[PDB]
Scaffold this active site. Structure first.
Site, PDB file in Angstrom:
ATOM      1  N   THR A  19       6.226  78.654  -7.497  1.00  0.00           N
ATOM      2  CA  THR A  19       5.709  78.997  -6.175  1.00  0.00           C
ATOM      3  C   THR A  19       6.520  80.122  -5.542  1.00  0.00           C
ATOM      4  OG1 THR A  19       6.889  77.033  -5.380  1.00  0.00           O
ATOM      5  CG2 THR A  19       4.506  76.858  -5.699  1.00  0.00           C
TER       6      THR A  19
ATOM      7  N   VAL B 104       8.055  82.577 -13.761  1.00  0.00           N
ATOM      8  CA  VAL B 104       9.024  82.150 -14.770  1.00  0.00           C
ATOM      9  C   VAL B 104       8.730  82.850 -16.091  1.00  0.00           C
ATOM     10  CG1 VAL B 104      10.077  80.188 -15.938  1.00  0.00           C
ATOM     11  CG2 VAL B 104       9.213  79.929 -13.599  1.00  0.00           C
TER      12      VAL B 104
ATOM     13  N   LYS C 130      13.788  81.810 -14.307  1.00  0.00           N
ATOM     14  CA  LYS C 130      13.033  81.483 -13.102  1.00  0.00           C
ATOM     15  C   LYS C 130      13.381  82.483 -12.002  1.00  0.00           C
ATOM     16  CE  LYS C 130      12.243  77.862  -9.590  1.00  0.00           C
ATOM     17  NZ  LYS C 130      12.761  76.592  -9.006  1.00  0.00           N
TER      18      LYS C 130
ATOM     19  N   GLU D 222      17.700  76.745 -20.850  1.00  0.00           N
ATOM     20  CA  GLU D 222      17.410  76.720 -22.277  1.00  0.00           C
ATOM     21  C   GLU D 222      15.902  76.759 -22.505  1.00  0.00           C
ATOM     22  OE1 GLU D 222      19.365  73.558 -24.320  1.00  0.00           O
ATOM     23  OE2 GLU D 222      18.154  73.746 -26.138  1.00  0.00           O
ATOM     24  N   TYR D 223      15.462  77.579 -23.459  1.00  0.00           N
ATOM     25  CA  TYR D 223      14.037  77.643 -23.756  1.00  0.00           C
ATOM     26  C   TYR D 223      13.638  76.461 -24.638  1.00  0.00           C
ATOM     27  CZ  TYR D 223       9.487  79.084 -25.596  1.00  0.00           C
ATOM     28  OH  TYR D 223       8.156  79.126 -25.957  1.00  0.00           O
ATOM     29  N   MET D 224      12.543  75.795 -24.273  1.00  0.00           N
ATOM     30  CA  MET D 224      12.001  74.672 -25.021  1.00  0.00           C
ATOM     31  C   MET D 224      10.676  75.097 -25.647  1.00  0.00           C
ATOM     32  SD  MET D 224      14.217  72.128 -24.604  1.00  0.00           S
ATOM     33  CE  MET D 224      13.332  70.615 -24.969  1.00  0.00           C
TER      34      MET D 224
ATOM     35  N   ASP E  35       5.683  72.199 -23.641  1.00  0.00           N
ATOM     36  CA  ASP E  35       5.625  71.288 -22.502  1.00  0.00           C
ATOM     37  C   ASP E  35       4.565  70.227 -22.773  1.00  0.00           C
ATOM     38  OD1 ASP E  35       3.497  73.448 -21.768  1.00  0.00           O
ATOM     39  OD2 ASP E  35       3.169  71.938 -20.205  1.00  0.00           O
TER      40      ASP E  35
ATOM     41  N   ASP F  88       9.321  63.971  -8.906  1.00  0.00           N
ATOM     42  CA  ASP F  88       8.173  64.749  -9.363  1.00  0.00           C
ATOM     43  C   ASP F  88       8.011  64.600 -10.872  1.00  0.00           C
ATOM     44  OD1 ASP F  88       5.937  66.273  -9.004  1.00  0.00           O
ATOM     45  OD2 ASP F  88       6.975  68.195  -8.853  1.00  0.00           O
TER      46      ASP F  88
ATOM     47  N   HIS G 153      -7.500  75.865 -39.120  1.00  0.00           N
ATOM     48  CA  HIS G 153      -8.708  75.731 -39.914  1.00  0.00           C
ATOM     49  C   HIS G 153      -9.432  74.434 -39.561  1.00  0.00           C
ATOM     50  CE1 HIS G 153      -8.533  79.060 -42.905  1.00  0.00           C
ATOM     51  NE2 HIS G 153      -7.256  79.064 -42.567  1.00  0.00           N
TER      52      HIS G 153
END
Ligand SMILES: CC[C@H](CO)Nc1nc(NCc2nc3cc(Cl)c(Cl)cc3[nH]2)c2ncn(-c3cnn(C)c3)c2n1
Lengths: 248, 826, 329
Positions: free
Chosen positions: C23, C27, C42, C100-102, C105, C145, C326
């Site tokens: 918001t 990101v 972010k 850290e990149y995951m 999600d 949340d 496929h």
């Protein structure tokens, strides 16, 4: 990982303000005024004591990295309190802090905020955050004064007199660079130590180890009396310099 | 907001199910054939089928069964849709007027349940006391067939066995009894229960559990003379009934998986079985009568009859005639003879019903220069693989080019007066260490041929062991003449090399027109391919010559020509290659923010990327800088099956849930984030699986054609053979057609009483949204088929907008003209 | 040093693309130019200057530099746009929070329909989530949340909790007015639908139980658009709020105002009969109407379903693959 927020007394002779020609007494006075301004503004706004202290700690730390001659104290103070309110979840609108600032400051003093008070403050938030290295969580002597006092058992009235007297010493220490010299846990013990001396109480008797004459060692490990005395000396100096006397 | 129109050009042709019974009259023998959303009713004659009635339903026909409860003269029809709509239907004919009655209707969906892996199973009791449904794992739903249950109310019985392969009601039981095969960690088992409508629970079943073949697939309920059940597997067929147990394991069936079964003799003596290689078997129940007077089952025998099309459903009709319903190839009527022909076969084909099969890819090409455009489709799979050339002329003319192997991608190369087609054929590991093909096919019957000699991956040192009998795919590029459709050349790719993408284009300053193929090295061990090739071929003087090869570190899922440069997707990466004066590919720039870039489309310097899960992204090539820039993405998560660019701002996508959507640039430049957000403005449940989007139209253009209200033309092919068309509308034309839909839905009677608004609502297992931005042209075009009273009822109080006259009332004759023009876009 | 945040520039990251929109800022996924590690940036936009640096980011910075857990998202650093030279008032540059990149999600994995969970996979998923939740709840922090959008999964099977923007400290001794509506409606506890405003950490447990059921059904359990409609759906499965099952329901401001159509009986065990017994008990306790009768995070970890789960075997879920591209003819 985490930054170091504690300096040696000797290091305060080399603060930015000192090297720009400000003498030790003036920086000390400027620090008392800024802290008390933060304290007085937030009290008028109804802010929690932690919120007041967090702002004051931000303020003290800030002027370890910048000079009082380039950053007006009352603007910095207002900015610290504004951020502290968000950190400690007691938020206030910037306009309201400015309103309260005008109420307590004279015209010469309020000239620091320039033509646009809110802007001068909101703009500083960036420098504040970078200066305090985004290390926002702060612990204060208050929580330790209570955590430790809860473990004392004895005369209810003698212990409450100790706590209130020590609490007052905490509020007074916010005007000093002790916040920059010793962890809050040590501050809490020192004020208990000071109040015990002044009230002629022997705190070890109230502890679980009543024959342990160094009563504080069970709360805070590795603290020599040397430290507690240095802190007591610094607190009582404020009372001797002023007209005010020990609360007793 | 965006406004679009979607119509069917060709209805679904693949056969999804077929039943026989006495539905139209207690006297006639009927054949009910189910295609996706379509029901066809035939009457069996001595020559063939007599069509009598066809209806559409606002749902995918998941269950179709005929039954006759006590007190009825003729069979009733039960249908369940994939959105869990149940209905009981009756045929009623008044002289020349044929209509279908909805006797009962309801939605059988549960708030909480896990959809079963083997899908909805629907069965009916031999005494027509109840309908059995297996919609969710661990639950058995019972609709009791009482006269008062017009709302098809139902209750669930807890089922301990969570993973059920197949279930049937049994014959010859004292109470309603189910027999099913289920899977738990110990293996597969067969088990029985009794169903008590009074207690609303299961009771112990008539016979004990038996451990069965690990790949036990289907349950056949044997009729009263024998009783019990038959269990069909990969290697064996077994009979179970209390203390009786038989098992025949003839080696012939091990070769190909059996997928369909039907009963020939009402007493259960003979059953028909079909397998994935198209073979048709007769399963024989050899009887033995005891002096007691009791009939028992002596033995089982399996006899090979011949070959049919790979069949989703079999149904025997009468005499020697069998209807072969095919989803992967053309459906059939075949006659079974008592005497074999000189080749040893007892099966002789009578009629062939066109099935466009799975449409894997397609392209529009004006072969005869007619400004019309014909559609050449990659259709079918395996033996049913075909190229289908489709032109408009009022029916569609369809030519079939048999390939006998799977077609994968197609592209047209005008310079060479031929098509390039990617294909794959199945070979099996044989005793030579190599492989042998089950049948000759296009890649082996080419005039000239070549095999790849590339050494790119030759270093290997990665072991891949082979067992005799295992299948492998062999991939080829076929060069096919545009007039004869004769296979001119076939190039076989490397062992374990799969061909994924094909383009025909010129690159850079190179005047030669090339065939370019993107491949992936796929080994069973790998989760995602990590090796691949981009190969440049030139078809010249009857021979295909390799011009250049580019090694990549992934699968080249999609390639597209980009202003003289080659745009390719390698796994997550989207790469732009330049074609040098040395006839080698040089990388210019990359984009990496993709999970799996499966689909690519270009317009000018804009690129639309289709992802396995991240929906669509709008990329842009920035020539000043020599790199890509992300313009905007659809952050809503969707599993894409095909994408297409409608115009500079609107983008069309297809979901694996049989859903269509349109994204548009938010066109609000206030914030950068709004521009970067593709908002889904169109939503529509198509009911088909879209594989290929292709710009073009099949309508004859003499340049005299009135400019239709619809602008643009996108054709799309689907798995069930359905061909559809998407086009855009003006805001005014949409509102008019949308308001008319709402009026038509109140007027038109739905089979099963299915709300049209429900049917077209965007639907995933997780979500349901009302349709938006899409006009169901198939509803609009039905205005012309409703009776005059209904037409006038629709136009009452209908006003036009944004026109020459701001508010203009509509008459029944005005709208007839409008719809008739809308029927001219296909 | 590593601790002097706010000074390093965002130049040190090659931006790969925009993974998501926040918001206050967008990101982005980026690669570190020096180490190659993939991170997510972010954007904290303070340009709005309505109230300055957003408190949501302040909370997430304040909390996440305290919280250390394998199942909690780690904020690596905070970096900045090239700042204007010697003119802080003109400077409007943003700040970026490095995480850290995951790989995925959960909302994306489930919505695409591209993930399958076995019982053992659900065991590993829930054991990690609850261990993270326990760590936080013992530090007296509340997520508030818990949605599938905030669960991040690597292909290894590691789970990390992510959006701490609405997170605040919880004091058992002192209850103060908190925001009445904090969790998204689908994962919102009944107490916050009735507006307790002084809620417990058990609100986060309710959300996770909803996730637990959704992992088995593959469809969210309580999907509604309106607060009352949610209460009806929860009431049908978990039973209608009544004084016998919730002794203090009468004190909730909206109890009389918001009522289900009927006083529905609890049917959870019946409707989730397909769920294994060890798990079904966990669901019944997690989806308990009364916040005091609702199990704690520690109690979920000491359950038959999760206690004997070894995290050495993380059990990666059935995540996308080449065959998934496929279609099975
Ligand atoms: C906000 C975006 C999504 C919303 O669900 N959430 C998210 N996804 C991550 N990776 C998974 C992922 N791969 C993607 C690849 C693509 Cl191509 C696309 Cl389009 C979206 C993608 N999503 C991630 N890694 C760290 N954080 C993070 C950053 N700050 N915090 C508190 C957590 C993350 N947040």
């Amino acid at each position: 990982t985490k930054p170091c927020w504690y300096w040696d007394k000797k290091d305060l002779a080399h603060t930015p303000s000192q090297l720009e020609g400000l003498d030790p007494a003036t920086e000390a006075r400027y620090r008392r005024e800024g802290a008390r301004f933060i304290f007085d503004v937030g009290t008028r706004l109804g802010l929690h004591y932690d919120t007041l202290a967090t702002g004051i700690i931000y303020f003290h730390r800030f002027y370890m990295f910048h000079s009082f001659k380039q950053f007006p104290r009352y603007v910095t103070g207002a900015c610290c309190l504004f951020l502290a309110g968000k950190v400690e979840e007691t938020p206030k609108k910037c306009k309201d802090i400015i309103k309260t600032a005008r109420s307590l400051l004279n015209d010469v003093q309020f000239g620091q905020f320039g033509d646009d008070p809110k802007e001068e403050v909101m703009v500083l938030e960036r420098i504040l955050l970078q200066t305090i290295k985004f290390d926002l969580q702060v612990e204060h002597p208050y929580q330790f004064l209570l955590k430790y006092a809860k473990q004392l058992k004895g005369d209810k009235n003698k212990i409450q007199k100790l706590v209130q007297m020590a609490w007052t010493f905490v509020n007074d220490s916010l005007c000093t660079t002790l916040s920059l010299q010793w962890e809050p846990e040590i501050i809490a013990v020192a004020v208990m130590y000071l109040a015990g001396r002044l009230c002629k109480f022997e705190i070890q008797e109230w502890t679980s180890k009543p024959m342990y004459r160094r009563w504080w060692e069970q709360f805070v490990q590795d603290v020599p009396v040397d430290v507690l005395e240095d802190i007591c000396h610094q607190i009582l100096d404020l009372y001797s310099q002023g007209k005010q006397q020990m609360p007793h | 907001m965006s406004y679009n129109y979607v119509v069917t050009a060709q209805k679904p042709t693949a056969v999804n199910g077929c039943v026989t019974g006495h539905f139209t009259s207690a006297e006639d023998l009927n054949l009910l054939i189910a295609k996706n959303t379509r029901l066809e009713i035939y009457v069996v004659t001595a020559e063939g089928l007599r069509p009598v009635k066809e209806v559409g339903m606002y749902g995918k026909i998941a269950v179709m069964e005929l039954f006759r409860p006590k007190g009825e003269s003729k069979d009733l029809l039960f249908i369940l849709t994939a959105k869990y709509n149940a209905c009981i239907l009756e045929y009623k004919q008044s002289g020349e007027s044929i209509d279908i009655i909805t006797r009962a209707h309801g939605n059988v969906q549960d708030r909480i349940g896990r959809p079963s892996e083997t899908g909805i199973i629907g069965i009916i009791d031999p005494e027509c006391r109840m309908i059995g449904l297996r919609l969710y794992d661990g639950l058995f739903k019972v609709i009791p067939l009482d006269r008062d249950n017009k709302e098809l109310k139902a209750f669930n019985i807890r089922l301990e066995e969570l993973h059920v392969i197949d279930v049937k009601f049994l014959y010859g039981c004292q109470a309603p009894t189910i027999c099913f095969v289920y899977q738990d960690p110990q293996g597969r088992h067969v088990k029985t229960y009794e169903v008590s409508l009074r207690e609303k629970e299961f009771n112990k079943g008539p016979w004990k559990q038996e451990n069965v073949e690990a790949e036990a697939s289907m349950v056949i309920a044997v009729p009263e003379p024998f009783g019990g059940a038959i269990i069909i597997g990969q290697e064996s067929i077994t009979y179970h009934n209390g203390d009786k147990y038989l098992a025949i394991a003839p080696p012939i069936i091990k070769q190909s998986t059996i997928v369909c079964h039907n009963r020939v003799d009402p007493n259960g003596s003979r059953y028909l079985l079909g397998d994935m290689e198209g073979r048709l078997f007769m399963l024989l129940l050899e009887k033995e009568e005891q002096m007691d007077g009791t009939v028992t089952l002596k033995d089982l025998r399996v006899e090979l009859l011949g070959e049919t099309s790979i069949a989703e459903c079999l149904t025997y009709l009468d005499n020697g005639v069998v209807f072969v319903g095919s989803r992967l190839g053309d459906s059939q009527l075949v006659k079974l003879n008592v005497d074999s022909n000189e080749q040893g076969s007892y099966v002789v084909a009578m009629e062939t019903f066109t099935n466009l099969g799975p449409i894997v890819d397609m392209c529009v090409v004006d072969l005869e220069r007619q400004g019309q455009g014909q559609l050449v489709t990659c259709s079918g799979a395996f033996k049913e693989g075909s190229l289908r050339i489709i032109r408009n002329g009022q029916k569609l003319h369809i030519r079939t080019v048999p390939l006998y192997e799977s077609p994968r991608k197609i592209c047209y190369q005008e310079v060479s007066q031929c098509f390039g087609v990617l294909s794959s054929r199945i070979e099996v590991q044989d005793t030579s260490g190599g492989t042998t093909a089950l049948r000759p096919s296009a890649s082996t019957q080419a005039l000239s041929s070549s095999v790849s000699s590339s050494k790119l991956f030759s270093s290997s040192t990665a072991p891949h062991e082979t067992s005799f009998g295992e299948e492998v795919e062999v991939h080829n590029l076929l060069i096919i003449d545009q007039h004869t459709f004769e296979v001119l050349h076939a190039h076989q790719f490397l062992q374990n090399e799969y061909a994924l993408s094909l383009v025909s284009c010129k690159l850079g300053k190179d005047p030669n027109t090339y065939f370019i193929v993107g491949t992936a090295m796929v080994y069973p061990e790998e989760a995602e391919p990590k090796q691949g090739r981009i190969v440049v071929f030139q078809y010249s003087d009857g021979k295909l010559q390799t011009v250049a090869e580019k090694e990549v570190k992934g699968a080249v899922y999609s390639m597209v020509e980009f202003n003289g440069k080659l745009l390719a997707s390698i796994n997550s990466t989207v790469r732009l290659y330049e074609w040098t004066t040395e006839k080698e590919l040089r990388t210019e720039c990359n984009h990496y923010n993709n999970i799996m870039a499966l689909y690519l489309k270009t317009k000018g310097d804009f690129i639309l990327v289709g992802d396995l899960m991240r929906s669509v992204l709008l990329l842009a090539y920035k020539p000043m800088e020599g790199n890509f820039e992300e313009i905007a993405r659809d952050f809503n998560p969707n599993w894409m099956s095909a994408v297409e660019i409608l115009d500079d701002d609107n983008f069309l996508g297809a979901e694996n849930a049989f859903n269509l959507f349109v994204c548009q640039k938010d066109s609000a430049a206030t914030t950068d984030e709004e521009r970067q957000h593709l908002q889904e403005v169109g939503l529509f449940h198509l009911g088909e699986f879209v594989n290929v989007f292709c710009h073009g139209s099949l309508v004859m253009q003499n340049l005299g054609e009135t400019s239709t209200p619809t602008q643009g033309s996108v054709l799309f092919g689907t798995v069930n053979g359905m061909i559809g068309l998407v086009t855009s509308l003006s805001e005014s034309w949409y509102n008019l057609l949308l308001d008319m839909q709402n009026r038509l839905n109140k007027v038109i009677k739905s089979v099963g009483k299915i709300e049209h608004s429900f049917w077209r609502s965007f639907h995933t297992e997780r979500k349901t949204e009302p349709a938006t931005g899409f006009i169901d042209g198939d509803l609009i075009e039905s205005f012309l088929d409703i009776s005059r009273p209904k037409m006038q009822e629709v136009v009452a109080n209908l006003q036009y907008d944004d026109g020459s006259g701001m508010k203009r009332e509509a008459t029944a004759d005005d709208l007839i003209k409008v719809v008739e023009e809308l029927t001219r876009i296909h | 040093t590593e601790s002097d945040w706010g000074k390093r520039c965002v130049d040190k990251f090659d931006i790969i693309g925009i993974i998501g929109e926040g918001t206050y800022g967008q990101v982005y996924k980026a690669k570190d130019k020096d180490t190659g590690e993939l991170v997510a940036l972010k954007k904290v936009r303070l340009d709005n200057e309505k109230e300055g640096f957003p408190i949501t980011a302040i909370r997430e910075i304040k909390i996440l530099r305290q919280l250390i857990h394998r199942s909690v998202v780690n904020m690596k650093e905070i970096v900045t746009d090239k700042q204007d030279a010697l003119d802080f008032k003109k400077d409007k540059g943003a700040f970026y929070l490095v995480f850290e990149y995951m790989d995925h999600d959960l909302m994306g994995l489930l919505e695409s329909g591209l993930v399958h969970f076995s019982e053992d996979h659900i065991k590993s998923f829930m054991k990690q989530l609850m261990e993270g939740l326990e760590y936080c709840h013992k530090k007296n922090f509340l997520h508030r949340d818990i949605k599938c959008s905030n669960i991040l999964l690597n292909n290894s099977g590691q789970i990390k909790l992510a959006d701490f923007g609405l997170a605040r400290l919880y004091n058992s001794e002192e209850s103060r007015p908190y925001t009445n509506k904090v969790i998204t409606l689908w994962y919102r506890p009944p107490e916050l639908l009735l507006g307790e405003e002084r809620y417990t950490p058990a609100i986060d447990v309710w959300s996770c139980g909803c996730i637990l059921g959704e992992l088995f059904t593959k469809k969210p359990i309580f999907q509604a658009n309106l607060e009352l409609a949610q209460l009806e759906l929860i009431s049908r499965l978990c039973g209608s709020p009544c004084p016998a099952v919730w002794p203090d329901v009468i004190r909730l401001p909206y109890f009389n105002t918001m009522k289900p159509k009927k006083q529905y009986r609890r049917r959870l065990r019946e409707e989730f009969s397909f769920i294994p017994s060890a798990a079904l008990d966990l669901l019944d306790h997690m989806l308990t109407l009364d916040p005091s009768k609702r199990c704690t995070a520690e109690q979920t970890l000491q359950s038959d379903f999760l206690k004997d789960v070894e995290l050495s075997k993380m059990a990666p879920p059935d995540l996308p693959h080449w065959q998934d591209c496929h279609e099975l003819w």
